[PDB]
């Protein structure tokens, strides 16, 4: 036990040692993956799009939008946009296909 | 430690027991002109003041006599 605790413990030293370069590999790779998915959800946001109009926000991060055609649409808004753009009478602009908002326009 | 502050402060109480409120009041004779005036300026003003407290303190009254003589 007592003197066996040394060389028994050395294997725990090595096993905790091996997590070092492993957590280096994860911390270097997953941030590269983070800018992968970050740039990939960025390039979803494309400038040709349709402009609607905002009517009401019925809960947080999900709202309704009056389209240009007058029909009201229910869209979960994108998370990066803060609560300033939840203005009820606003010039909101969704995508032409994704129909999620990139930016609102100044009147 | 900050317990070696204690004999240094015993030295300070000996310094305050040298003169008992003779320098606080007499130096407060200068402090009552000097209180709330920014003392970085009082080092410049004290610098040229103590520089000219010996001689030629005002001296701008003398330069008109330095015109014809120099």
């Amino acid at each position: 036990d007592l003197y066996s605790r040394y060389k028994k413990l050395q294997q725990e030293l090595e096993f905790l040692e091996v997590q070092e370069e492993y957590i280096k590999d994860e911390q270097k790779n997953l941030k590269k993956e983070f800018l992968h998915a970050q740039e990939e959800v960025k390039r979803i946001q494309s400038i040709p799009l349709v402009i609607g109009q905002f009517l009401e926000a019925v809960d947080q991060n999900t709202a309704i939008v009056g389209s240009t055609t007058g029909s009201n649409y229910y869209v979960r808004i994108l998370s990066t946009i803060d609560r300033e753009l939840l203005k009820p009478n606003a010039s909101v602009a969704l995508h032409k296909h994704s129909n999620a908002l990139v930016d609102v326009l100044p009147p | 430690m900050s317990e070696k502050k204690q004999p240094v402060d015993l030295g300070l109480l000996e310094e305050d027991d040298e003169f008992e409120e003779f320098p606080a009041e007499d130096w407060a004779g200068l402090d009552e002109d000097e209180d709330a005036h920014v003392w970085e300026d009082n080092w410049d003003d004290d610098n040229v003041e103590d520089d000219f407290s010996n001689q030629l303190r005002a001296e701008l009254e003398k330069h008109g006599y330095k015109m014809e003589t120099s």
């Binding site: 036990d1 007592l2 003197y3 066996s4 060389k7 028994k8 294997q11 | -």
Partner: protein, 187 residues
Amino acid sequence: MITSAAGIISLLDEDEPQLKEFALHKLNAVVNDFWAEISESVDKIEVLYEDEGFRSRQFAALVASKVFYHLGAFEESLNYALGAGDLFNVNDNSEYVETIIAKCIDHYTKQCVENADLPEGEKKPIDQRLEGIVNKMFQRCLDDHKYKQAIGIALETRRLDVFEKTILESNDVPGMLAYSLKLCMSL
């Protein structure tokens, strides 16, 4: 006795060693007081050690070996504690002797791992007084073995006949082989 004496430096810088020797004797009393006052005479101690002109290489190498671990690396102290030749030294609970046999044992089994993977060819020389002072304190543990570290160090020292003398006087022999293989499969 002394603290700031530099006359001992000038006497250590002096020939006719019958005045050097008791000066070194009185240096060995004040060494734990001041090793750093000896740090300037380290060079002269080394010079009177490297030659065989002065008669006592262990009075030199003990002083240098006890000032180096106060100054720098335990290797350079260790080369003169191990390079002091024959040293008549009893076991003591003093810090100096246990540190030098401590780093001696650690670097000894370091050498034993360094040559445990090399059974044949380019075999590095191990001085025999290292084996003597490792197995002297080791067999000193093996007066009674203390029922544990005989097989432990005997596996750490990576040496062949170190453990047959452990099992010669050993109590509960299947306890020692099961304890033994228990340690051996855990390493």
